[PDB]
Design a protein around this ligand. Structure first.
Ligand SMILES: NCc1ccnc(N2CCOCC2)c1
Lengths: 237, 300
């Protein structure tokens, strides 16, 4: 059934699973035409498919050419996401294929279900959690690879960097969702927080800075402060 | 005109014949139903006075044999049986009519309702849905489950309706996952019509029989099958024009005949609102949409 606070630690057991988020698949800018009408221009996009246990991120870049000549792009986006998750599973060895796929939005259930009808032993699940994966495009290196792509392309990342060397996957997912929640509520502050100290760098093969354990606790606290605050600045409290 | 005699009426029972019904009291001198129109299937059905649980009944065609009802006190129901001795049968029926111990099938001359609800229903196809080859009539009751329900337990007592599943291999072509799910024309026209039913008349026959079993027995899996066969047509962008026209007449007479008080449980809000207002065929069912809006505007 649905994934919620009550069955949260299931994400970190030894059953392979993937989150699929489609928020950033179909992305547009809205602008005025010379005639004063409004028009959209699509920009590149991405499917965010994440193993929460390992940190393995399969970032499927969605190049604007996939929309050319198509109608009803919001609906098509969901089916395209489903088509791409489906070939990802088909290309992976049987022992790596997920036993569950959890979608962050319920409108992905029916698309993913038809695409995987010949995979009856993979459970497709929704969730009641309001996970902040849309903020994935606020991670500079992921935004960069999406925007520079000139053709469809799959890029593999570990979104936990090397954290699993020192913390458990439960703690690594909690850190990740805190960072993404922060970047989603106030991207500028969040980024200032992460990059304030010039001496802490991001390794070429990482996405985030090389914080010590002590520094991560400071950072995490600073991100909590931000989230409560903006929640004040928002509801005035 | 044909006749279904009854040996007797030992227990108090509400008897249905087609869309008509009448009450018979315990040991009342009742010996059956006469003047039944030849040329149509019929259903004779029962609801005991003590146990409104289990409505049950028999589908039959009078052209296929001489049939009668006899109460069985061991199994506790009114049982349909065939009489093979035609002289014994005619002699029995003639005596009961002479003594005027039979109720007359009460058809109004103007009234095409039964014809319209059973236009495409054939006894041969009923017997393939309700498998009991040794009898020429078919027993159905409220509790019988469908083959597809049994996939989600006794196969002998099942309703072998044609399985329709919108998120399936027959339904969906490899590489046409979005096309075939949003526009079910290929599932309707090639798989079901051309492949399984052969023609729209057999399709409409099963769709009418499912309705009738949902209405007369409150059979839940038959209701599921009726709404599914409607939904498959409404969800198909490409449907022969003659089929849309006939479907509108079919549904119109079903909606007209439904008891107003049973609409809450026999009509699926989602399917009906989708078919009449969202689907490809939202503008092709004028008679059905008109009677639904005037009779059941709450559901919509
Ligand atoms: N993409 C799911 C899907 C949809 C339709 N047919 C599929 N088959 C039929 C061919 O052999 C097995 C795979 C698979």
């Amino acid at each position: 059934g649905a994934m919620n606070s009550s069955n949260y630690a299931e994400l970190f057991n030894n059953d392979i699973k993937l989150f699929v988020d489609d928020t950033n698949v179909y992305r547009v800018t809205v602008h005025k035409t010379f005639e004063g009408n409004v028009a959209t221009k699509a920009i590149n996009g991405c499917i965010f498919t994440l193993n929460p246990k390992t940190g393995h991120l399969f970032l499927k870049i969605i190049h604007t050419s996939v929309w050319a000549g198509q109608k009803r792009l919001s609906q098509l986006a969901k089916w395209k996401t489903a088509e791409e998750v489906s070939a990802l599973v088909r290309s992976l060895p049987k022992e790596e294929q997920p036993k569950q796929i959890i979608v962050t939005r319920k409108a992905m259930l029916d698309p993913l279900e038809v695409h995987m009808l010949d995979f009856p032993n993979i459970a497709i699940r929704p969730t009641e959690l309001r996970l902040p994966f849309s903020a994935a495009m606020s991670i500079d290196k992921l935004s960069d690879v999406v925007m520079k792509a000139t053709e469809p392309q799959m890029v593999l990342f570990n979104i936990y960097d090397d954290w699993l060397d020192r913390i458990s996957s439960y703690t690594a997912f909690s850190r990740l969702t805190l960072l993404l929640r922060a970047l989603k509520t106030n991207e500028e502050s969040a980024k200032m927080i992460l990059l304030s100290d010039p001496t802490i760098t991001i390794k070429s093969y990482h996405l985030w800075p090389s914080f010590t354990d002590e520094q991560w606790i400071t950072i995490e606290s600073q991100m909590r402060d931000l989230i409560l605050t903006e929640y004040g600045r928002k509801y005035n409290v | 005109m044909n006749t279904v005699p009854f040996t007797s009426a030992p227990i108090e029972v509400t008897i249905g014949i087609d869309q008509y019904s009448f009450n018979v009291k315990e040991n009342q001198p009742f010996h059956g139903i006469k003047d039944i129109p030849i040329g149509h299937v019929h259903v004779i059905h029962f609801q005991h006075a003590d146990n409104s649980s289990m409505r049950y009944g028999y589908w039959f065609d009078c052209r296929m044999g001489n049939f009668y009802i006899q109460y069985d006190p061991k199994d506790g129901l009114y049982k349909m049986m065939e009489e093979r001795d035609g002289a014994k049968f005619e002699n029995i029926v003639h005596n009961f009519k002479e003594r005027q111990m039979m109720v007359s099938y009460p058809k109004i001359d103007e009234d095409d309702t039964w014809y319209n609800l059973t236009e495409f229903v054939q006894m041969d196809k009923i017997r393939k849905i309700v498998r009991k080859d040794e009898n020429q009539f078919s027993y159905v009751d409220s509790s019988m489950t469908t083959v597809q329900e049994n996939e989600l337990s006794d196969p002998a007592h099942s309703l072998n309706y044609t399985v329709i599943n919108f998120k399936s291999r027959e339904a969906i072509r490899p590489g046409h996952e979005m096309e075939d799910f949003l526009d079910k024309s290929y599932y309707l026209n090639t798989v079901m019509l051309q492949g399984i039913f052969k023609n729209s008349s057999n399709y409409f026959g099963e769709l009418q029989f499912a309705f009738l079993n949902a209405m007369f027995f409150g059979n839940y899996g038959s209701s599921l099958q009726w709404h599914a066969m409607i939904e498959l047509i409404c969800s198909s962008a490409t449907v022969p024009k003659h089929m849309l026209d006939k479907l509108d007449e079919i549904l119109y007479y079903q909606i007209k005949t439904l008891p107003e008080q049973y609409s809450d449980i026999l009509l699926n809000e989602r399917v009906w609102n989708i078919c009449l207002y969202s689907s490809f065929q939202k503008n092709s069912l004028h008679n059905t949409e008109k009677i639904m809006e005037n009779k059941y505007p709450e559901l919509l």
